[PDB]
Amino acid sequence: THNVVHEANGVKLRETPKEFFERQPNKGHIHDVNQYKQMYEQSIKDPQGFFGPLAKELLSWDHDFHTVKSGTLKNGDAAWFLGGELNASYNCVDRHAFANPDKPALICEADDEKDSHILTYGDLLREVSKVAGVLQSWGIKKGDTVAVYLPMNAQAIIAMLAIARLGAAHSVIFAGFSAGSIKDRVNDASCKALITCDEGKRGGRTTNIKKLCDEALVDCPTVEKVLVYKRTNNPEIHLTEGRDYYWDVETAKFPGYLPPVSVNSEDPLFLLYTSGTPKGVVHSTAGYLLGAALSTKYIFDIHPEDILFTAGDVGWITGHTYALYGPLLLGVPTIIFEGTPAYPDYGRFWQIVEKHKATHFYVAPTALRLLRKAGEQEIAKYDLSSLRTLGSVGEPISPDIWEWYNEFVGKNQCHISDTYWQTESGSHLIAPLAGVVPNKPGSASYPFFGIDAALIDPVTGVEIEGNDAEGVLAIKDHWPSMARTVYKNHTKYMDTYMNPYPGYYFTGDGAARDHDGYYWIRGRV
Amino acid sequence: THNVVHEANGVKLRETPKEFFERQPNKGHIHDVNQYKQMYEQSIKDPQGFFGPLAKELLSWDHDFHTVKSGTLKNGDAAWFLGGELNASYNCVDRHAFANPDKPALICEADDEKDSHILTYGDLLREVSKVAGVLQSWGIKKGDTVAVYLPMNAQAIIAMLAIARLGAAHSVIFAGFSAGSIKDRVNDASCKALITCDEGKRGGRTTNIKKLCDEALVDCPTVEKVLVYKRTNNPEIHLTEGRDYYWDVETAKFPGYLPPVSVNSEDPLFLLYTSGSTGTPKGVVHSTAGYLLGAALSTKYIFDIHPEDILFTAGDVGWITGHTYALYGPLLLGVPTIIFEGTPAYPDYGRFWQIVEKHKATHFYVAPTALRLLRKAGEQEIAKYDLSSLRTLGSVGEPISPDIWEWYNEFVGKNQCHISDTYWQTESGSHLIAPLAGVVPNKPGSASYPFFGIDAALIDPVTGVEIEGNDAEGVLAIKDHWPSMARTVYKNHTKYMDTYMNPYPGYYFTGDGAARDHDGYYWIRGRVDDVVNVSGHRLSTAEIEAALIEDKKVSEAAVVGIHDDITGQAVIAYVALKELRKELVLQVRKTIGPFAAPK
Amino acid sequence: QTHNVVHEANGVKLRETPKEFFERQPNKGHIHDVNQYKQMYEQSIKDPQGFFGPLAKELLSWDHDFHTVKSGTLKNGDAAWFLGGELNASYNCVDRHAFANPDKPALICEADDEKDSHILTYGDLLREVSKVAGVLQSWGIKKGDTVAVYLPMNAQAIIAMLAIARLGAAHSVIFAGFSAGSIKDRVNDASCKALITCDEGKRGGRTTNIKKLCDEALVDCPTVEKVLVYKRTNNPEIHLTEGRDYYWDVETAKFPGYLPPVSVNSEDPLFLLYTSGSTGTPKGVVHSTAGYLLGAALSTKYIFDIHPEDILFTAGDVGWITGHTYALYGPLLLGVPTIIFEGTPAYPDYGRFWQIVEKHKATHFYVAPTALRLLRKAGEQEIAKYDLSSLRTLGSVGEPISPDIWEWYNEFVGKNQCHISDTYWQTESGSHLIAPLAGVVPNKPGSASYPFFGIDAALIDPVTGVEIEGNDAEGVLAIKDHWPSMARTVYKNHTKYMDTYMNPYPGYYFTGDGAARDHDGYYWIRGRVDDV
Ligand SMILES: CC(=O)NS(=O)(=O)OC[C@H]1O[C@@H](n2cnc3c(N)ncnc32)[C@H](O)[C@@H]1O
């Protein structure tokens, strides 16, 4: 009985349902919790012997790395896989296309299903190559930043991967953001180009995209050229002569293969700005990609035969890591949903899952609460038997929402993964592994590989030893996918994460841990 | 008895003469036609296991490749040796210089023999490095295009290899092209620099080079700097201050070694502009690794090139023949190549044979047009010279008539040499159909069997369906892409698809009609798409018509092609005036070039 | 044996290495005896490929392997070494040592005033270099650019050089005392895109004008886009031109403590070093990357007998080739600490050098004879106050060392317990040409002794232009074939390079120095050929 961790009292462990293992296509990646603890202990005690092999296994390198791990938190010089060279678009597209070009890669569900379509890895390579050829002709090169202002669809994925192909860093801006937000982000990154579309369609409603871009770009001198996709082909949308060019017109000029550009492990893969003044969280290439592939493989128990549906927007780190990189690195299909959970009806999510026999579903608790209110009747209409792993992202999931998730969507036949992580962490920090870790509803459970979790007493600034404790959550050493800096403001990076608790990474979240070692997220501090 | 292939009836196979194998420096690369077909079948069914090893054997890689072959014709995304890195100038120059820097590389015969000279691989390395150092100081870098407007001499080769050394793509413009032609090509490629010379010498007459470049460059804003070689050192030739600089003066500033720049297999090696059925010339883009492998492979096997051999390709670098078989093929194989600046007639019609005797050339590559001209005027001169060093004779650019084939064999070859009628296009990069020297017996006038990686096929033009069985005629196509296939048309990939890939989906469209006989030999009957080959030059009737219409006095114009005794085919122009023939001949001479003028 | 020509040699007894040298050396010597030395020397001359290939792979960390050890000839000025290889100098000087042991001292910085002294570890140096390189990379500096340095001898000069190298650019270091016109001429020749400097310098207790001379030059240097200024004195009266000048601390705060290095080809230029020139125009000596670095590490290891445990103190300025090779590259490639002295030998007193040596137990000391003569005049009394037992190798650079100065050096500084290395070399040679190896070659005072690996020395008669065979000879000193660290060109003027070194005596490298060789083969440098 915990006097501090009141959540832990009288909550029974929920073993993984049998139907999960029935539906699992192959042997599990981890046999039992003990094997997990052995691997975890190695990842903490021996990051070299643990991550080196996995990095070589899960990633295709243009040049081998000579040092797995370097740098410390206090000095803000963390680096992983030093000396290595690779290209993200190759690991997400090229190698899979060569293996089997006809395998589905992007299952695109549009706002209206009539406009839905599917791209194979061969298709994705050709589109990415063409956009990258357009960008290369425009002078985009390694070390540049390219802005993306697109909804959740194929063009957002293709834009990101083409920018990566050339070695540039993409900065994805949520399509709903105001013109002033676009202005601040583009000017901070000094983007040389922008990829967007004339208009968007969401929930049946047309949305202004190119209009807001124009209103922003009048104050963004760095943007030399804009690439506009005709999502709606509305003739009234205006293109500025000498700056705005059409996606289809330009991609028609260039061939379906373009050599990728090799980049160093620690060369920046992308900037992601977080909502005060916006700050650009910078993520390297090698460390971030490994974190995405590693978490996607083990936390969700993804197998080659599987199909993932991450109901998140690329404007959010969730979309980046688990809608694009994690899945495509592992070569599995990923579902890209442009619409709203309600349009045309609140059965939209389930309609898509049944349509594509999705094996994994990843959603935020906010949508779960909305669907609890309005779409309970619609859940029963659709066939969700293909699913076996259900994920929760972005906020604490209350046990009642946990039980609702388990009953109506999972049918108490699926594993539930409550994933705790930040934009800065790149990938999962604390999460219960699918098919390995029994669940405590509302608990993120054990930390993942490379994550040495700790609880600090805020007043003393001292780590709290032992279980049955509550405090601010910190990490004792840097992990592969940890953000390396804040764009052109490394002092802010240090002051925000490294300096507040020296020797630690400060999450900004308070949490508690019970006698079983499960971590309970108490929310922001 | 062929009911369709009338050419094949009553044609006896011509085995390679015994004297060929006597003169051959070593055992042949292929034993017999049977081994050739076994290797060919492997190249078709299993291109990875066939070309992968050859690529490692014949090319020196900075980074190893992970995939031999990728992409399809239907999608226009063909790629070979993916992930590999290499440099063309290293494979053509550096490695051979290290082996033996004193080995001859460029045997340069100038328009007048007094100006002739020879460069060793060490010499070529130093000159290439110096020019590349000049270009690198000017800001030329990987991904740029550099224009070349030079005659056929050492400086053209050096300019091309220097551009390649830096990872840039060279665009060679035939020295005869008009100022307007230079303008269009430079502006299409947006070249940052141009390499040319003050004046040229051809057939004993001085020609204006820097003059035409200046006239073009007034409308070429992308050209930041020009490198001018003192071919004649005429002081009256004017250099634009701040743009024009002298070859000798600038190269003197930089050292004789410059590190080569690594490039990906599919990074573009060069642009070559070809007149098409459009009215505007199109820049054919060729990759690096695939093109180089095709050049070395075809040069080695079809011509039976050995290290001891010397090749004489009587073609201009402005033509794909010069690129592949005057420069890259030979230098990749490390053999000397003869670079002839003059004409077959100057000073006398024994000029070619004089050169062959002078350097004991083992291989000779020429277009049938020159053979017909020398047959007309220079037949007597062959006997004065010693041509015994030759064993392989090549034909390029046009169908070779059996009568010219026999003339070639009898008077030049002395019925002691192999004859290789090579069929290929600028777009193919290297040979498509040709009889391998010492391997394939010849049917005069037939290119014979297709080469490695080339899965030739005849399509019924009317139905668009592949024709099974022999003794058939149809439009010639290729069923899968090959290493040296052109990858795009510069910044216009849609024209590339519409021209080659889309007309017969799943196939490569040659634009040629051809036949296949019972023995499998292919007979090229010429273009189907109204393109005319005059004296070895591909010309578009559309471009000539547009040039005719430019003249305000002409209201309508229509141009066609017909048989010509000397140039193979001639172009005849018909004009309608609203209310002068020499003026129109000069108008097209000014619009395209002296070569494209109508007969 | 009376030498008819080599009058210096008569009556000079070989001076064997003192016993205390071997007592103090932490490990077995790199070379057993002179006989082994001559075997290796002969191999380096006859078989440079089989000799330098292995050493190059041992001492340097390569991003891409090389396919040819040696290429080109002197007569054609196309020398190239380790062709096809790729590497980064800042990685070999900083990164690899930092990963091995980040807390090992790298830069032992002794400032003009000792209170301002500090020590940077290899980990510290990695972070500082990475941050400066991040500043420069954000400014657009990239491979193929040149960056000028106008700094005194302190950490910031080393860091600036290594950061420029990290990005693949070539650094051109300018002596801090040089006039504005000198800065102008050098910057414009190189067309430098950026400049790194400080507000003011402090030398011998007095403040010195640095930023002022830079500004006066930069009004005529249109290529310089941006300036990085370090607050050495933080004098508020110092003016920065807005839109060009930015502060070292302010900018480096923006960027992270690790930056990936940029790989460059062996023969890509590592640095330009301009030489003080008689007549009008200064000439920029260009040094490759692989060849120069190997020469630095090789000479530093063998001539001075540097071991990982050792500490080196090179009393030379980075504006001089001595600072480049043996204050920065040589020691840092070998991963040993190097002492960086900002002040003068006299301030606060003439015991400053010896104070530093005792403070950090420096094992190797490298100085020019000029300082030795000055200290002989004024600072003999201070030597006795300090403990120099840590020393075992004493070096002389830049001038002929008089036998009297040699004995003074050995007795008062070395206590007749150290080896003395009279190193002969030029900016163009990159590293030592003729020098007696510590603990291997017995010394004749005033003689540079035997040539070093890869140096095939020869004497030419100026009148006949013919090599002089046999010993007891005098002539102009030349080298018969190019060596790894030989200068490759003079920036954008290769004809001047040829006319100066290659063309006067074709097939030879012309040192511009006259020298003699005695019966034992020891070389005696007699000085420049003009003025003989
Ligand atoms: C992935 C993401 O959302 N990145 S984020 O940059 O948007 O940060 C979101 C913040 O919300 C909190 N949070 C996120 N996920 C959970 C979770 N599964 N359980 C409990 N709290 C959670 C925490 O405070 C995070 O830092």
Ligand SMILES: CC(=O)NS(=O)(=O)OC[C@H]1O[C@@H](n2cnc3c(N)ncnc32)[C@H](O)[C@@H]1O
């Ligand atoms: C290499 C070259 O000349 N490229 S090219 O781009 O100029 O095209 C020339 C065109 O001439 C025709 N052609 C070329 N070679 C032969 C040959 N051996 N036999 C019969 N016809 C031939 C065909 O029509 C070609 O396409």
Ligand SMILES: CC(=O)NS(=O)(=O)OC[C@H]1O[C@@H](n2cnc3c(N)ncnc32)[C@H](O)[C@@H]1O
């Ligand atoms: C390192 C350095 O000095 N670079 S430098 O370019 O400044 O050298 C210029 C000249 O210095 C002379 N010189 C150098 N060292 C000695 C020495 N130990 N004994 C006699 N003369 C020496 C030599 O004549 C050089 O050519």
